[PDB]
Nucleic acid binder design. Structure first.
Lengths: 125, 167, 207, 186
RNA sequence: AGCCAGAAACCAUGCUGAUUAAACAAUACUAUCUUUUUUGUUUGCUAAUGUAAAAGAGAAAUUAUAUAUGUACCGGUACAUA
RNA sequence: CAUUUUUGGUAAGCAGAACUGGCGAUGAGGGAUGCUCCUAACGCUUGGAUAAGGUGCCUAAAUAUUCGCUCAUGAGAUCCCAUAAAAGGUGUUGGUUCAUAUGAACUAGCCCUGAAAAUGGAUGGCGCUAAAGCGGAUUACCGAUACCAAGCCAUAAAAAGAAGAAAAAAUUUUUUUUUAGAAUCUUUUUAUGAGUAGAAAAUCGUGGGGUUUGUGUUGAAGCGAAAUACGUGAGUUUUCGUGGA
RNA sequence: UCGUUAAGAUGGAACGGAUUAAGAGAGAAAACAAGUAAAGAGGGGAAUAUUCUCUUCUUUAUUAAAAGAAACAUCAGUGAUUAAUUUAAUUUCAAUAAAGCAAUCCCCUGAAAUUGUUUUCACUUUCUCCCCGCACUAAUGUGGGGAAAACUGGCUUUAUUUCUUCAAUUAUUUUUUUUGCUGAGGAAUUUUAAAAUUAUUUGAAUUUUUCUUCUUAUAAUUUAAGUUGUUUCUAUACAGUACUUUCUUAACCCACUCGUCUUGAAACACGGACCAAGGAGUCUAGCAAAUGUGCAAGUGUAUAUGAUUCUUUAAACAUUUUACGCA
């Protein structure tokens, strides 16, 4: 059920996958809100796939936080180090999809100079 | 002089005159209790909502106990109120300072016996949201008056035992 | 020293205070605002002359006699070392079933009360500490196997505090043993383990 | 379940904050909000609210009308939460002290020529933060031509709203129900 | 309350089926193999693991119920015992 | 559609009205089952105690207590609700009037007769008779997202606001962490949270354009498979594999 | 869509929700270990191209520590339990052992002669005794008829209450035994102030006090002023079979074809074999209100002219004082 880690409480692990998605193969699993009449979702019959709800929303101290205890910041250029040094105690680097290996390695070295771990550090090696 | 009236019944399917009297009475929630100044118009209003309320004479221990354990008060500006547990006299000594009450015992005294300053104190306090009775009822939809076992309407003194049961 | 509101007389111990939090903006503070932690104030069943069952230790089921209540609220207990080979052990009152039965059954045993009391008086919590240097010394052996477990037991044995505790334990056992030993039935009861079987009611059972 | 009128909510209406992206006016309302919250007086609060209001609630105030009011207040400072317009029905000025949201250049020049005083709201704020000995003014609300079409249905008894007429033409919208001779009359 | 005889009806009997019982019994012969003990079971494969219920998994008169069981006499009588 | 008043029509789950409440537009708990009956209206969670309703088993709680009545060769068993009457009864139980511990007469309680249909068949089923039947009463226990307390989320309203040293580690001085002032903003408080048709706002994505400052063959986009990933969510972000602009 | 291999499942559906499980995978980025010493690889800054000096990664081992999960204790909030308790109140007793009083009698309870009375006689026990019926009975007795007494009960007393009692039901109160659940917050001046409590100090009070009250002065503390402490363990790990987490079946409880028009669809109402791509409130005209913007008794610059305007320029810029639209 509910997932405490320190004073970071996250309410719901399980994603609100879309109503009867396996039943009709054409349906995709990402949420879509029925405008149907007698849909067994909005007409709120118990035991079906649950609706997402704002109530499940994160606590304001946590909001977007990771179990890392640092907010993730995605990095595609070396120059992004300069704000990240001042924020290192509150923010963590993630290196972007594209980043060429020579540049990526250089950013990884820079991140170590900034004393902040890369959360996807082993990538492209 | 006073009568304590406890609501018993849900807000589904309410008659329209009964909705109006409930609105004036302030028993909006199903386990609301409130103090009422004995009068004839108040009694007649009480008679109209009777099958949805029990009521009676509360006794000093109960009055003291209820205000102490379940006393909340309306803190904010006129119709910009907020529900605060009392916990200190200085707050309520502010609003009821003009009418010279200034203290929770004085509030207990007026609630227990209707005196010069009852309406304001009564209004100023938040309506008592009670628990369920911790040993239930014989049958909710039947009168205390009935030969058949029941609970609604005048419970007189014995209202106190019910209040103690549902505190 | 104590607070007496509603007649209670609590008994106050200075709180150690250890946990720091980063505070509202600037820097950090210790979490504990209070300065005095309440003394434990154990239930009246727990008492020195009583023999008690150790519920779930290594030596569990043994009938062991209380010695000293420590300031931690943890008390010391021994299923005599002469009788059973069992250490003078630290225990909570939550893990020890104290009986009504009294070690001082006879006048001879009661005449050796002061010596037992002096022996009881000397012990303290610091003798029961693991010791980080020693704990590491045992750990550092990891990186045939059964032998190393024996060596860990030897390392435990070597400690001065363990030896000091064992001395007092031996002195208490030596002091009490002959009078205890002379009554064979009581000795057998002392040796005998607590047991649960059919017709162990628990709820009506007297201890 | 608690029975609640309007679901317990205060759902009062009107402007939340200035919808314009205009920097000077956003800056100006920040100032007057600051003054309004700190200051004891109503005056600042009323000015702040009036500054926030829509365009149709920003009417122009006539210079003649301001002049007509201020002659009973002869040394005092008028503030106007709208624009001040000039008057070509007006022979001359009697010398005035005016703070306004906007000045037409001809009016401003006339005020300067008269030896009067043109105050911006920031300058007024500096000089008179209390609003003591100042005079709040505002222009006509119901002067506007849309409102001249508002009110009781055209052709319905006692009505006097202007119709949204088809065109200017002579033959149109004077017959049925608008003269007794043809059908009836309002 | 207690009973009796009494119908082309009823249930057996009879007769048919019975991989309708994921049913079963007896007999006949056979497959380096069976039996006892020790250690192991942290290229599709080629050492090898599973339990719905250990914790003292302790306990075999009997018709009974407006009375039973022995023992002694001739299903009955007498005498003990729960 | 329902209660109550109600008109037509033999009647009708029929047609037509009145007042009010529901459903429609509504989940949830009970009614064996059931759009509407009863209880009761709903953010996300933890705990409590109750309601309607139950407590022989299915099926959670009593083979509870307590007084009656009840045996049926088709008994009976929770509103709506799925049949049932006039009329009988020397079955049994109480009454009440008469007569002389009996003979009459009545009376209403239960039970019986009155009481026949269509796949096999329905107190929900099994069953139940010292009830688990019918009529009471006495408690305890069980029983909801309703009720109370607590946390968190958003919405609504209200407060309030346009500058300074805290801790730990060392050996007073060195070392380690922190040190907020961005108005659709930050801190705080209380209240609120149903929903078709419908209205609004906040978002997220796609094609192109200007602008800004980046990503590219030390393999990007794309695609498949994923990720202790982030978001209430649409989504976003990322890894490995393929891939080659 | 179909094939291969492997893993799982399989008693008339199939999938799902909620919650755990066992398997199968994945992971170290918070999910342990700063600094110190040794020798490798790099990089910088200063002094007047190289001396001085500062730095980060690999490597050997070497002391910290912190962090979470447990566990108990301690508080404060909120429950559940099982013992109680105070002084009142309300036609409430019961014994204790000595006295008395009356026998169908009395505490009682019957039955009788607007408005009050009051008076009459009816009523107990017996394991006591007698007579008839003699064993006649449900009976270790008995049907009928009579007596006897005061043991029994009842009243009046006098003492007595832990011998046995001192109920019960209200009223105001005061506690207590186990125990369940909870811990938001984070106090640069509301974690402040007072209260409380303890040790002091001064004056009073009164039910008169080893938790008696107030206020006079001083300190500490917490019941004030939203959890803290201690000890384990993970672990002396570097990813493991543990731990995180995905997938996977299970199992308990719940779970009717979606869209759709219709008051009403799980329907014996209609559409839908399946998958991919494409696929439906737009544009112009005129008008209106809204809100922004510029100006104001004016406004727009129309057609068009003009220019040191000429890839982008098909726009941009300009307009030598009673033109026209609308006001």
């Amino acid at each position: 059920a509910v997932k405490k880690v320190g004073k970071i409480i996250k309410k719901r692990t399980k994603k609100f996958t879309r109503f009867q998605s396996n039943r009709f193969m054409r349906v995709k699993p990402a949420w879509r809100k029925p405008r149907g009449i007698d849909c067994r979702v909005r007409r709120r019959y118990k035991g079906t796939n649950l609706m997402p709800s704002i109530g499940y929303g994160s606590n304001k101290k946590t909001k977007f936080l990771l179990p890392n205890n640092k907010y993730k910041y995605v990095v595609k250029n070396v120059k992004e180090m300069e704000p990240l040094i001042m924020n290192h105690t509150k923010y963590c680097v993630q290196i972007a999809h594209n980043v060429s290996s020579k540049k990526r390695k250089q950013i990884i070295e820079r991140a170590k100079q900034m004393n902040v771990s890369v959360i996807n550090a082993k990538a492209r090696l | 002089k006073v009568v304590f009236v406890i609501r018993l019944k849900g807000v589904n399917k309410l008659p329209p005159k009964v909705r109006s009297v409930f609105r004036l009475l302030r028993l909006l929630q199903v386990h609301n209790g409130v103090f009422v100044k004995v009068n004839k118009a108040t009694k007649e209003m009480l008679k109209i909502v009777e099958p949805y309320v029990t009521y009676g004479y509360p006794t000093l221990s109960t009055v003291r106990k209820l205000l102490y354990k379940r006393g909340y008060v309306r803190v904010g500006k006129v119709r910009r109120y907020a529900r605060k547990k009392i916990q200190d006299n200085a707050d309520i000594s502010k609003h009821l300072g003009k009418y010279n009450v200034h203290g929770i015992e004085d509030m207990v005294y007026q609630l227990y016996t209707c005196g010069p300053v009852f309406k304001k104190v009564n209004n100023f306090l938040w309506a008592f949201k009670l628990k369920p009775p911790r040993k239930g009822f014989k049958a909710k939809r039947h009168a205390f008056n009935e030969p058949r076992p029941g609970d609604w309407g005048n419970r007189e003194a014995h209202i106190n035992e019910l209040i103690n049961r549902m505190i | 020293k104590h607070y007496n509101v509603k007649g209670k007389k609590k008994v106050l111990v200075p709180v150690n205070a250890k946990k720091t939090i980063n505070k509202k903006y600037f820097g950090r503070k210790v979490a504990s605002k209070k300065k005095y932690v309440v003394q434990r104030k154990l239930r009246k069943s727990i008492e020195v002359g009583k023999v008690a069952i150790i519920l779930t230790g290594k030596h569990m089921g043994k009938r062991c006699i209380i010695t000293k209540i420590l300031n931690s609220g943890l008390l010391a207990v021994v299923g005599p070392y002469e009788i059973n080979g069992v250490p003078l052990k630290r225990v909570d009152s939550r893990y020890l079933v104290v009986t009504s039965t009294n070690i001082f059954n006879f006048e001879n045993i009661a005449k050796l009360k002061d010596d037992f009391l002096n022996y009881a008086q000397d012990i303290d919590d610091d003798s029961f500490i693991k010791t980080l240097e020693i704990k590491k010394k045992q750990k550092k052996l990891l990186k045939f196997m059964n032998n190393v477990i024996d060596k860990i037991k030897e390392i435990r044995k070597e400690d001065p505090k363990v030896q000091k505790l064992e001395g007092i334990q031996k002195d208490i056992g030596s002091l009490l043993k002959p009078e205890i030993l002379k009554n064979k039935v009581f000795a057998h009861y002392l040796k005998s383990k607590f047991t649960l079987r059919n017709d162990m009611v628990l709820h009506k059972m007297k201890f | 379940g608690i029975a609640l009128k309007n679901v317990g909510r205060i759902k009062k209406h009107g402007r939340k904050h200035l919808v314009s992206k205009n920097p000077y006016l956003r800056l100006l309302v920040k100032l007057y909000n600051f003054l309004a919250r700190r200051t004891n007086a109503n005056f600042n609060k009323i000015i702040a609210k009036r500054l926030i209001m829509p365009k149709r609630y920003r009417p122009p105030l006539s210079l003649s009308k301001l002049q007509y009011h201020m002659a009973n207040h002869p040394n005092d400072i008028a503030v106007v939460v709208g624009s001040i317009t000039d008057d070509k029905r007006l022979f001359s000025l009697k010398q005035l002290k005016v703070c306004a949201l906007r000045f037409t250049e001809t009016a401003r020049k006339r005020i300067e020529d008269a030896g009067g005083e043109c105050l911006t709201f920031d300058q007024l704020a500096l000089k008179y933060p209390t609003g003591k000995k100042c005079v709040l003014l505002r222009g006509p609300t119901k002067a506007r031509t849309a409102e001249k079409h508002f009110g009781k249905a055209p052709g319905k008894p006692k009505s006097k709203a202007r119709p949204y007429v088809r065109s200017k033409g002579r033959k149109f919208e004077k017959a049925r129900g608008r003269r007794k001779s043809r059908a009836y009359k309002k």
